[PDB]
UniProtKB/Swiss-Prot annotation:
Tissue: Specifically expressed in immune and hematopoietic cells. Expressed in bone marrow and blood cells. Levels vary considerably within this compartment. Present in at least 74% of immature CD34+ cells, whereas within the more mature population of CD33+ cells, it is present in only 10% of cells. Present in the majority of T-cells, while it is present in a minority of B-cells (at protein level).
Subunit details: Interacts with tyrosine phosphorylated form of SHC1. Interacts with tyrosine phosphorylated form of DOK1. Interacts with tyrosine phosphorylated form of DOK3. Interacts with tyrosine phosphorylated form of SLAMF1/CD150. Interacts with PTPN11 in response to IL-3. Interacts with receptor EPOR. Interacts with receptors MS4A2/FCER1B and FCER1G. Interacts with receptors FCGR2B and FCGR3. Interacts with receptor FCGR2A, leading to regulate gene expression during the phagocytic process. Interacts with GRB2. Interacts with PLCG1. Interacts with tyrosine kinases SRC and TEC. Interacts with c-Met/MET.
PTM entry text: Tyrosine phosphorylated by the members of the SRC family after exposure to a diverse array of extracellular stimuli such as cytokines, growth factors, antibodies, chemokines, integrin ligands and hypertonic and oxidative stress. Phosphorylated upon IgG receptor FCGR2B-binding.
Main localization (coarse): cytoplasm
Family named by the database record: Belongs to the inositol 1,4,5-trisphosphate 5-phosphatase family.
Organism: Homo sapiens
A Gene Ontology biological process term: phosphatidylinositol biosynthetic process
Subcellular location per the Swiss-Prot or TrEMBL entry: Cytoplasm; Cell membrane; Membrane raft; Cytoplasm, Cytoskeleton
Protein's recorded name: Phosphatidylinositol 3,4,5-trisphosphate 5-phosphatase 1
GO terms for cellular component: cytoplasm; cytoskeleton; cytosol; membrane raft; plasma membrane
Keywords: Apoptosis, Cell membrane, Cytoplasm, Cytoskeleton, Hydrolase, Immunity, Lipid metabolism, Membrane, Phosphoprotein, Repeat, SH2 domain, SH3-binding
Amino acid sequence: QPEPDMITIFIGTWNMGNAPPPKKITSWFLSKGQGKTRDDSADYIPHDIYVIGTQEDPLSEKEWLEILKHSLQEITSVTFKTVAIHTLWNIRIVVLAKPEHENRISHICTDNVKTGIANTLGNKGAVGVSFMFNGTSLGFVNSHLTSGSEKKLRRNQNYMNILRFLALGDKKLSPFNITHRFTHLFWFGDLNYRVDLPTWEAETIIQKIKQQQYADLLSHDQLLTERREQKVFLHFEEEEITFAPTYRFERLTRDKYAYTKQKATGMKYNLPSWCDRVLWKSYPLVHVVCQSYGSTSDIMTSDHSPVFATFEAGVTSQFVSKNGPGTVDSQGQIEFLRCYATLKTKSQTKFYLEFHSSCLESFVKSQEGENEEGSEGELVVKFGETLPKLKPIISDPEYLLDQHILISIKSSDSDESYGEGCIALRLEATETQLPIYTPLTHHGELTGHFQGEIKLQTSQ
Ligand SMILES: Cc1cncc(NCc2ccncc2)c1
């Protein structure tokens, strides 16, 4: 029975509005409704992994797991295995997988982050799960960010706190946050970003939605505009939105958006908005394709509609050779030529690099770089030809070309990372000098870039 090269992953996000679900929710898991929907001919084909994010979830874990499992069993005739479930207040994540995957899944981690302080600490935050699927690391974040049209900067702050403090994945990757720890990271939830148009335009917006004309609304979507301005979700992707706003509906129908200010809303307007979102970030040159992104039309217990997204994701096998794991494979090496880091910092410490990769027995520390003053005031840290030669555990090109090197640039004075990035070994050639590049981020904000050349030697 061969190991898979690709799996499909279902991501769902639903703010349940503190109400129990209706008796049938299969349309969610089938990617049926509005937007980019799944072909009917696939209805009986199970996804490999289902990741369900809820917000304002009133059910117990037991209650929701029985609904989810019975739903999937009705669709597929498969009894899914529970990988992980984690709940913070009313924010929940469930991961289910086909039983055949049980002995492919390991290193399961869960964590949560509570956002805010005093007044704003006690219901918003995030839950997440990570695990290894054979040779591939997967991370999943369900966040419920701050509500309200005039709180986009709070949402951006909530995002930064979640990616700084959520402790998932390999703890040896100590300079790296969740935006660098996983081959594939999916971040979804009630992100709560709104369509920023004047309150007076509510009925105009409703009109546009009835005509399925979303362009003039999406051009004012706060998540799209903040992403464009590099204020949040830097280096994440989102599929084009082709479904109506998923909030705020009158319950028990989808015929009416309830936008007007009421005592129950704190006298705030809730103009129709795409609160409910799925984004992803995968390592460079790894296969990831969004197959569906949409909302259901027939699940009406909440003031939000459920959102679905599905992906075809590249995975790799748990490689064994005669040599690695547990020794090096002299026949492999990774070399770096003409490398330099450019950093936005005003600081003047010396810097060194750390190279982290599961193709190495342990991380590798470089010598200090040579600081130069760049022509437009920036800091250039030159490594030239001084970087160590990295010694992978396995030299087989079928393994090595699928790997990645994480890079941290650290201060010699504090050993704090000033920037993190990632280089793919999926090169156009071996034994050949080729350009490499990554942006560098810290706390998920841009701090610089690293570029140079690489030369990869495999056993072939
Ligand atoms: C509008 C916007 C927001 N955030 C990032 C970008 N980058 C360009 C891009 C990103 C994905 N795929 C193709 C092109 C663009």
